[PDB]
Ligand binder design. Structure first.
Ligand code: SF4
Ligand code: F3S
Length: 106
């Protein structure tokens, strides 16, 4: 499974959903997650993220390990997203800010 990590929060570009063959992204107010069961590990999404927030599960940085289980839990509750949409308004002010997990909205 590929995992979306911290830098997606408050950026939410949605470029990643274009390339997914299996539509495994689920949408929250200010973040996206990948559903782990459904992901086929094709890796096509991680070159597409402008925030460079997507990682193969086995490459998630040590300080972002929480995101692996988070993608798994939130994917069970959030709606499926299959079309790109516009980035959140202030997306590049927040792109690159560390520690955005305190800002995640359910
Ligand atoms: S690795 Fe492929 S199947 Fe998994 S979320 Fe990314 S684009 Fe979809
Ligand atoms: S910022 Fe997030 S919405 Fe997709 S394109 Fe990157 S993982």
């Amino acid at each position: 499974a590929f995992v979306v990590t911290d830098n997606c929060i408050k950026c939410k570009y949605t470029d990643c959903v274009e390339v997914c063959p299996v539509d495994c992204f689920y949408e929250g107010p200010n973040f996206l997650v990948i559903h782990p069961d459904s992901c086929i590990d094709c890796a096509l999404c991680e070159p597409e993220c402008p925030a460079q927030a997507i990682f193969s599960e086995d490459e998630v940085p040590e300080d972002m390990q929480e995101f692996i289980q988070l993608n798994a839990e939130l994917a069970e509750v959030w709606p499926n997203i299959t079309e790109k949409k516009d980035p959140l308004p202030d997306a590049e002010d927040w792109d690159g800010v560390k520690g955005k997990l305190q800002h995640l909205e359910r």
